[PDB]
Design a protein around this ligand. Structure first.
Ligand SMILES: C[C@H](C[C@@H](C[C@H](C[C@@H](C[C@@H](CCN1CCCC1=O)N1CCCC1=O)N1CCCC1=O)N1CCCC1=O)N1CCCC1=O)N1CCCC1=O
Ligand SMILES: C[C@H](C[C@@H](C[C@H](C[C@@H](C[C@@H](CCN1CCCC1=O)N1CCCC1=O)N1CCCC1=O)N1CCCC1=O)N1CCCC1=O)N1CCCC1=O
Ligand SMILES: C[C@H](C[C@@H](C[C@H](C[C@@H](C[C@@H](CCN1CCCC1=O)N1CCCC1=O)N1CCCC1=O)N1CCCC1=O)N1CCCC1=O)N1CCCC1=O
Ligand SMILES: C[C@H](C[C@@H](C[C@H](C[C@@H](C[C@@H](CCN1CCCC1=O)N1CCCC1=O)N1CCCC1=O)N1CCCC1=O)N1CCCC1=O)N1CCCC1=O
Ligand SMILES: C[C@H](C[C@@H](C[C@H](C[C@@H](C[C@@H](CCN1CCCC1=O)N1CCCC1=O)N1CCCC1=O)N1CCCC1=O)N1CCCC1=O)N1CCCC1=O
Ligand SMILES: C[C@H](C[C@@H](C[C@H](C[C@@H](C[C@@H](CCN1CCCC1=O)N1CCCC1=O)N1CCCC1=O)N1CCCC1=O)N1CCCC1=O)N1CCCC1=O
Ligand SMILES: C[C@H](C[C@@H](C[C@H](C[C@@H](C[C@@H](CCN1CCCC1=O)N1CCCC1=O)N1CCCC1=O)N1CCCC1=O)N1CCCC1=O)N1CCCC1=O
Ligand SMILES: C[C@H](C[C@@H](C[C@H](C[C@@H](C[C@@H](CCN1CCCC1=O)N1CCCC1=O)N1CCCC1=O)N1CCCC1=O)N1CCCC1=O)N1CCCC1=O
Ligand SMILES: O=C(NCCc1ccncc1)c1nc([C@@H]2CCCN2C(=O)OCc2ccccc2)[nH]c(=O)c1O
Ligand SMILES: O=C(NCCc1ccncc1)c1nc([C@@H]2CCCN2C(=O)OCc2ccccc2)[nH]c(=O)c1O
Ligand SMILES: O=C(NCCc1ccncc1)c1nc([C@@H]2CCCN2C(=O)OCc2ccccc2)[nH]c(=O)c1O
Ligand SMILES: O=C(NCCc1ccncc1)c1nc([C@@H]2CCCN2C(=O)OCc2ccccc2)[nH]c(=O)c1O
Ligand SMILES: O=C(NCCc1ccncc1)c1nc([C@@H]2CCCN2C(=O)OCc2ccccc2)[nH]c(=O)c1O
Ligand SMILES: [Mn+2]
Ligand SMILES: [Mn+2]
Ligand SMILES: [Mn+2]
Ligand SMILES: [Mn+2]
Ligand SMILES: [Mn+2]
Ligand SMILES: [Mn+2]
Ligand SMILES: [Mn+2]
Ligand SMILES: [Mn+2]
Ligand SMILES: [Mn+2]
Ligand SMILES: [Mn+2]
Ligand SMILES: [Mn+2]
Ligand SMILES: [Mn+2]
Ligand SMILES: [Mn+2]
Ligand SMILES: [Mn+2]
Ligand SMILES: [Mn+2]
Ligand SMILES: [Mn+2]
Lengths: 183, 183, 183, 183, 183, 183, 183, 183
């Protein structure tokens, strides 16, 4: 069932820093997924992980509280603490970030189709109102609620560059067409 | 008298970073208290320690001078130096911080009752006038002299989140009711 | 189902070094077990992990090849390499160590009952002949095949001391009676 | 052909930090040049390398994307990603930096003749329009397109000081006259 | 009562490595002693601490179990584990080391009088029979039970050199006469 | 002539961080002075060293160029580079800092008498016009040319506190009266 | 010509430690080879590199002098020094190791065919007499001159296991058949 | 008088590890010598320093006490401690090592002439009888008292190789003829 190695798994290990892959592993394994088999989902979780960390890096020192990359029970503990101190409505699904500057939760998505389609997909799910949504694609487009992009252009710009670089490296090894088909 | 371990002691060691617990130990031991017996006071000193360090983190680079977390004789040495260079009145009790931006000493308190009650308690003690007071609770309320909160909202907001997280983790192990009763 | 914390989980985190608990987690999670729920099995895996590492520490520089503490598919890869170079019969179950000095696989067990009973239990399972068995208990007894204890007295002696220390610390927090009942 | 050591090579190793010389080596070797023979070009690549890193240091946190100091195929990958997300025209030659704040590529040159002459030399080559040019000399002069110097005075000032220091140390060992003649 | 600094305290901090003084502090404070006041006892505890660590360094890899330098309740836990696995008689007083090679506890003493006198003093106290005693002096003499010196000459020789060096440095600052009078 | 240790030398080693004392040693030794004999001058050089480093810390990222704490021949090399790129007049004596923001050299002095007296002393020596002077005392007073204090209040305030702390610690060991008499 | 990535290159980066691949790169580049194109030769150089380092690890502390993994001009410098101090005949080709215990140079080879064939190949080339040869294969066989295997069984055994593991991981990604065909 | 740099100084900094050159500097400066002027003596002190450290590395764990590389007053303190504990006669000149295994001081010399001549030179000076002498040359010869070479062949062999390598690198930059003439 689970093999000794795949071309995707080895690219993922040489593409993202060891802290990112360590956390995607514990995250996937927390939800009954094996990165050695679900190789495309493995690349997605690492991409989604790195995006969230560059996003929180763009803000001020104490601007964001990182929800993603935590144990699922720890993540709900921080969400509970944020809601019970700010009074913000408790979301139905685990968000990725909390923005202390704007007092709203953020959901971050990475898509290999039109940002228009994923945003509508993610918007029909949340239904928490106060939860901001920010969608990125592997082509360089972004999409935010109220067109409020939270961060400046330059922080958002480097995220788009990272995504296109990942798209090229995946294609140079003939792994992109399978990746895009997975979503 | 002193045992090999307690449920509170093991939670404190897995909740605060090793630098905080190392300093609460040397602090408690400096005042004839054993963290292995006074387990609730041990959790209080670590909580009070972490709050003071996040507080000084919110300010500018050279904004604060940290008084708490020092040897009691070293702490009075820095207080003497601050008074003898700024001319500020020497406090009767050891404060936690000194604010170079506002030229006042800060006393920081953490309570498991109403911030209204602790503040009045801490205010009747100081009687140093120029010493600012900033009270936090485990429910998310704060209380400052003149309603001058020194730091911005976001720095104060994350402190409240940390406190509520500690309250949850203490309750998940059935240790909160004893902790709240200790104060 | 899975909680925020247990008394066993917090003791395990303050008892074993962070590398051991990190590996027991990835190991348990590899086999569909949550250390946050299976708290006793969590303590067992960390105990069994630390024993195997002190055991390989007793030997010479290049004496042992560590099988335990690897990804289950990586562990079989090393077993395959050892069998295909030494010609040793391939075991039916994953062993813990390989001894280059004696050219045999080692299975290491830790018991909270009589070493006599566990050894007979582990012996009826293996049926690989060339696989050595070495059993330790939390009372200070050991038991090896052919009474060949592989390591000297002093290396085996410190392992017994570590086990009895763990037994005391578990009892000082009233967690031993539940632990012994789990096996 | 290639010797065991030269006076220039030993000065270069004691003048630039080990990360700079490691990267100039991999860079020169990528283009069929031996730093042990092409000793002057070795000093030039290290000087040009250190300038580019102080330049990107002057900007904001996420201001610049460093193109220089990468594998030549990786450098074109980042250039492709920057062009395909910002829409900027793809340069004909590899630039040194990309400025997210001003949305333009930067070419950085270091000269031992008049900044007037090198700039005209570098300008006739690029012909990419949107590529900014910033020229420094070992005498303390600089020269930028549209006289847009991108960075403030103080960041540019320390770069000039570093260059003059390198010029002195090269002269104190009687190696400057050969270096200036190489360009 | 407790001052800001003493000549002995500053010499102790510049004479022993920071790990030794950190442990003497926690040890003295565990027994209601202030190193800032009991300055001579502070130097004694650091000397006695460093001797015990060089002693365990002389043996083999797994030869010794270090009892000194632990929390007093942890130290009794290891003693209990050693007795309950080796069957050795439980000592009445906390020893410094346990020797796995010779299966006996070791008490290590450092004296500023005749090794003859201290040994008789320490021998009348123990009355545990199986507890070995090894006495060192600041003049270069040693004294062991049965004249069994456990370690070779060279390991014992360097310990004597360290002690005489400490005696010289204490005398060069005119602090030795007070130190010798303290014992 | 040169002894094994002095009370001042041991206080200096426990008062300043190891990087400061390492540099004062190489500095004093560069000018034919032994820190083991010239113990007061040793404390002065470490105090003067730490002041210069906190001063450059108060500014912006690339604001200052540190002249003090370099080899005397390296220090003149940087001074030459600064003069030959900014066109500033070359000072007659080695300054401590260069301020890129204000384009002037800074001379920093620490006194145990009136800042009024030392400033007049340092001013009669320089005669370089463009060289700024900033004097601190161990009592909390400061004195700058044109009353241009270069840095804000809070950065200057912490320097005064550090100086008064050093004055107290020197007095608590009865070493201040000799120190003040040395200047 | 040179691409952005290959399946072999990514496996090599996830299989050998970063120090090994860094040195194979500088080695291949020293001889006009690109690891991004010569992917199989890249895997060979890393395999040959790791073997040489485990080999020198098997000996005593000062037993071996490592020739492989050095700059080609530095390697001849050490060879010259070894010959001119021991009087050993200078080899015609660069060897991998020098054995101080047996006073002979060692050439280490790794083959994907019969050790019988490679040894005869390497033996016809050297013609230095005093140069020892030690051949390993990816199947677990070894072959040494005079059947003098220099190291013990256990050190040689782990090298064979490492080689077979590499053979499996290469096959699990369908890269072995191309690798074996390259030699 | 003292310049900004010399060809010898830059070779010395790229030839010996930073700890060696740092100690030769403090050593030379302790005796009124500038490594920036006395460039040949600078290379000699670093060579002599590295030899002494490889020598003590050849022995057992606690075999040697390193006298060289200490402050001159600290070195006499250790010599005093060694004499006053072992009873060995106090040498007239500072030796380099003390051998606990053979209970004798060692003087280590490095020569660029015949080991026969330097040994006779060093022997006429000591006149301490119990002080061993061990002479090395840059050609690969050694010379010890009673032909007692203290260490085995392999430890002494690598020292000779290091010396010949240094001789080659000095010659490749045309610096050897001046170095040999200095002695
Ligand atoms: C401390 C950490 C907090 C964050 C981790 C996150 C990742 C960050 C890593 C840092 C180092 N950098 C910065 C430069 C490059 C790098 O590698 N990265 C990795 C990719 C880019 C980036 O910025 N950040 C951001 C602030 C500092 C930090 O570390 N995380 C991880 C999930 C939960 C969480 O809060 N924690 C807290 C305890 C567990 C843990 O890991
Ligand atoms: C240097 C130190 C000064 C402070 C210690 C305080 C704690 C700080 C630790 C740092 C690391 N960070 C920052 C990221 C996380 C972390 O762990 N923490 C711990 C909890 C959060 C935090 O911000 N800070 C703040 C400035 C830098 C620093 O270290 N303290 C301790 C008491 C006295 C004092 O002045 N000192 C000076 C000498 C002794 C000592 O410990
Ligand atoms: C390198 C490692 C190899 C071993 C890990 C094992 C654990 C060892 C940790 C070391 C550090 N020490 C020694 C002093 C204390 C300590 O903490 N411990 C931890 C408990 C006691 C002990 O001795 N050892 C033994 C040799 C060196 C080493 O590290 N392991 C882990 C499972 C697979 C494996 O081979 N590897 C290889 C790659 C992954 C990894 O982790
Ligand atoms: C992380 C790195 C990114 C940069 C490297 C560049 C060099 C920087 C080094 C840092 C450390 N500092 C800062 C203080 C002194 C120092 O030494 N220096 C060296 C000279 C001065 C300077 O500021 N910077 C700048 C941001 C942080 C960093 O490291 N580079 C190198 C080429 C490609 C690239 O992006 N990376 C990314 C992966 C490979 C690598 O090396
Ligand atoms: C790991 C530690 C175990 C020992 C500490 C003891 C001290 C040792 C320090 C080491 C580093 N070295 C060796 C070179 C110099 C140095 O500094 N020193 C200090 C003086 C000389 C020496 O050899 N040793 C010996 C084995 C390795 C080690 O660290 N200790 C301390 C008291 C309890 C205990 O078991 N532990 C375990 C957990 C807490 C802790 O501190
Ligand atoms: C890099 C260094 C540049 C500076 C050294 C100076 C001292 C600084 C040390 C840093 C670490 N911090 C900051 C937190 C505490 C600490 O310890 N300190 C020591 C006292 C307080 C302080 O801020 N600074 C300032 C910028 C970063 C740095 O390191 N110096 C030393 C003399 C010449 C010089 O330019 N260099 C360059 C090469 C040689 C060297 O040492
Ligand atoms: C110091 C080094 C000397 C050797 C490098 C070689 C590699 C060794 C790395 C060490 C760390 N370990 C040991 C545990 C795992 C590890 O990673 N490895 C890597 C694979 C296994 C191994 O044992 N060894 C062996 C002795 C110590 C050391 O480092 N080399 C490299 C080529 C030239 C040379 O002499 N040097 C000297 C200067 C340049 C350099 O790199
Ligand atoms: C600890 C030190 C003791 C010794 C220093 C000496 C040098 C040793 C450095 C070590 C690291 N290694 C070993 C691998 C390479 C390396 O770099 N080297 C440098 C060249 C080769 C070598 O083996 N050694 C030997 C034992 C460990 C150690 O460090 N010294 C220095 C002079 C006085 C003294 O006793 N001390 C004690 C306090 C001051 C100090 O520096
Ligand atoms: O919340 C998310 N994951 C919670 C924890 C987790 C992590 C990894 N695997 C399973 C669960 C989360 N997931 C995704 C990925 C990519 C596309 C859809 N997809 C998904 O698993 O749902 N995209 C997000 O934007 C996001 O927020
Ligand atoms: O100053 C304080 N402690 C000085 C040093 C010290 C540290 C630990 N134990 C004893 C003494 C200090 N203490 C406390 C704690 C929590 C509630 C009351 N309580 C207390 O011990 O008084 N709350 C503060 O706000 C505070 O400022
Ligand atoms: O792009 C550049 N190099 C790409 C990679 C590279 C690095 C080193 N060697 C060869 C190729 C690049 N080179 C230079 C140097 C200095 C003067 C002219 N010169 C040159 O090699 O052309 N000056 C730049 O300003 C620059 O941008
Ligand atoms: O420039 C200075 N030293 C250059 C290098 C140096 C360092 C140490 N010792 C000798 C030379 C320098 N010195 C001092 C000290 C303190 C009081 C007077 N004094 C002095 O040595 O003149 N005060 C400064 O303000 C200053 O700028
Ligand atoms: O000496 C050797 N390389 C010197 C430096 C070097 C390194 C990498 N590429 C080119 C040159 C060396 N090479 C090899 C490899 C594997 C099979 C044949 N092959 C080869 O390149 O010849 N096998 C050895 O056993 C060996 O000793
Ligand atoms: Mn998420
Ligand atoms: Mn998301
Ligand atoms: Mn307080
Ligand atoms: Mn407080
Ligand atoms: Mn197992
Ligand atoms: Mn097992
Ligand atoms: Mn370029
Ligand atoms: Mn350029
Ligand atoms: Mn004791
Ligand atoms: Mn004792
Ligand atoms: Mn100065
Ligand atoms: Mn000054
Ligand atoms: Mn080779
Ligand atoms: Mn080879
Ligand atoms: Mn000497
Ligand atoms: Mn000598």
């Amino acid at each position: 069932l689970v093999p000794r190695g795949s071309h995707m798994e080895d690219f993922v290990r040489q593409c993202f820093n060891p802290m990112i892959v360590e956390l995607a592993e514990k995250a996937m394994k927390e939800y009954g997924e094996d990165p050695k088999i679900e190789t495309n989902k493995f690349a997605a979780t690492c991409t989604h992980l790195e995006v969230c960390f560059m996003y929180s890096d763009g803000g001020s020192k104490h601007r964001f509280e990182i929800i993603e990359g935590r144990d699922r029970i720890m993540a709900w503990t921080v969400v509970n603490s944020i809601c019970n101190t700010t009074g913000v409505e408790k979301p139905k699904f685990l968000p990725d970030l909390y923005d202390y500057k704007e007092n709203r939760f953020i959901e971050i998505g990475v898509t290999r189709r039109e940002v228009h389609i994923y945003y509508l997909e993610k918007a029909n799910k949340i239904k928490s109102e106060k939860t901001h949504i920010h969608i990125f694609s592997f082509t360089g487009e972004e999409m935010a609620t109220k067109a409020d992009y939270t961060l400046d252009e330059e922080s958002r710009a480097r995220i788009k560059t990272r995504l296109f670089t990942i798209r090229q490296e995946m294609a140079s090894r003939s792994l992109w067409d399978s990746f895009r088909q997975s979503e």
